[PDB]
A paper describes a structure:
In the 1,2 arrangement the biotin-binding sites of streptavidin are in a cis configuration as the binding sites both point in the same direction. To isolate cis-divalent streptavidin (1,2 arrangement of biotin-binding subunits), we introduced a series of aspartates into the loop between β-strands 3 and 4 (L3,4) of the Dead subunit. Introduction of the charges in this position means that in the 1,3 and 1,4 arrangements, these charged regions should be far apart, while in the 1,2 arrangement, the charged loops should be apposed. Since L3,4 is important for biotin binding affinity, it was necessary to insert these residues on the Dead subunit, so that the cis-divalent streptavidin could maintain high biotin binding affinity. Overall, the introduction of a series of negative charges into the surface-exposed 3,4-loop of streptavidin allowed the isolation of a second divalent species, cis-divalent. However, one condition obtained using the Morpheus crystal screen yielded the desired asymmetric unit for the cis-divalent streptavidin containing all four subunits. The obtained 1,3 trans-divalent crystal structure was solved at 1.6 Å resolution, and cis-divalent streptavidin was solved at 1.4 Å resolution, with the phases in each case solved using molecular replacement. For the putative cis-divalent sample, the electron density closely fits if chains a/c are Dd and chains b/d are SA, also confirming that the biotin-binding subunits indeed had a cis orientation. Furthermore, while the electron density around L3,4 could be clearly observed in the SA chains b and d of the cis-divalent form, the electron density of L3/4 was poorly defined in Dd chains a and c. The engineered L3,4 of Dd (chains a/c) is expected to be highly flexible, which would lead to weak diffraction in this region.
The femtomolar affinity of streptavidin/avidin for biotinylated targets, combined with resilience to harsh conditions and an on-rate of ~ 107 M− 1 s− 1, is the basis for biotin's central role as a specific biological “glue” in diverse research methods and biotechnologies. We previously generated streptavidin heterotetramers with exactly one, two, or three functional biotin-binding sites, through purifying tetramers containing defined numbers of non-biotin-binding “Dead” and His6-tagged wild-type subunits. However, tetramers with two functional and two Dead subunits can assemble in three different arrangements. To generate a controlled and stable bridge for bionanotechnology, we demonstrate here a method for the simple isolation of streptavidin variants with precise cis-divalent or 1,3 trans-divalent arrangements.
Author numbering:
A (entry chain A): 14 to 46, 49 to 135
B (entry chain B): 16 to 136
C (entry chain C): 14 to 46, 49 to 134
D (entry chain D): 16 to 135
């Protein structure tokens, strides 16, 4: 409380580090599976979650530009943090690429990822 | 182009600032849902978009807690800014509520919002 | 009287023709924007909708294979029918392409489309 | 390999037949939600998939009305069949409820279900 701050691991090797601020801020760095693969992460979480067995709602964005590379796209992850011995962040995500109007219908991928505090 | 006050199709107000760096900051006031007054938002955008007529990718998050209410929820919007005569931000969103594990299957709503610098209707 | 049977037009050129069966069946053809561009459509709808002003829930699928082409992908539309002078079907959709596991993370596009009875 | 009885991670039962012409037919019984007993499903699949190691694209719909209950809603699953050691159907789904116009923004739930021929 909160157990969100720290390092989180996805199934296929992505890793992020985040600080959950007392004001509801999420800030950190996302590393897609060196610094060439590291991107700024910024989001928000419920800083006063229920203590009734529910998850803690959250979301964040990564725009896939850094000093080295730029995919002209951005992912947002929406989900909840589930605490305990096997804590997890369960998310669904949208990845939108910049497109022309003609190609806008195929601008956005949807998917899901779970993150854990230990490597899977 | 992104910095300014935007309105979605339902009348919600999105006041955003785009930093030189890729940062989005601002406030969101929803016209619908378990929400009242302004909420903080943060996000990111592509600060060096392509020069081929493509839009500018972006996204942001609102956690639906402020000094007055808490819905134990958060929405993320993912989309692109399209400049021109009439600038638009076209998005799809995910709204996740805290749930127990048994109810996690019904935790997340999906939708689509289009933002313009004029109020709707 | 479901009001669904007939021809529907998407905002960007696509057309479909559907029959709403008394039992909840949707059956028809989707033409993408031309038999080369026509595909089988099948789905289901709520044949006894609420009478409180709510729309009529429905969904359908098109696999993008016909006798001429195969994109190795399928779209599902999930939405609701709203009747009246300006009847419409408001949908959100998921398009999944067959991929290897390594590429599964980019298998599925999401979007939305509204269909009307006039172009 | 699609024809058969499948279960998702919640214990829902998906009984499906794949027709030579690309048709999917069968029944769905949900372990969760406003649902009782079997519901009719129909859908489509790619009857001539790639041979390059890709999965087989498919989708289906259930309207949540049967002779017992009506939830005024429909779910569509969009995904792919992955033949493997243990065969799997990986999906994402959209559940839309009939709503008034004022509530249309909250009409649609999204999630992801994985189906195997084994029940959890």
């Amino acid at each position: 409380e909160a157990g969100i701050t720290g390092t989180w691991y996805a199934q296929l090797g992505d890793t992020f580090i985040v600080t959950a601020g007392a004001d509801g801020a999420l800030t950190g760095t996302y590393e897609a599976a060196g610094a060439e693969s590291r991107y700024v992460l910024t989001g928000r979480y419920d800083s006063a979650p229920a203590t009734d067995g529910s998850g803690t709602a959250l979301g964040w964005t990564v725009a896939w530009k850094n000093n080295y590379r730029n995919a002209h796209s951005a992912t947002t992850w929406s989900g909840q943090y589930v605490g305990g011995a096997e804590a997890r962040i369960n998310t669904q995500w949208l990845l939108t690429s910049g497109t022309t109007e003609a190609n806008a219908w195929k601008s956005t991928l949807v998917g899901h990822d779970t993150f854990t505090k230990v490597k899977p």
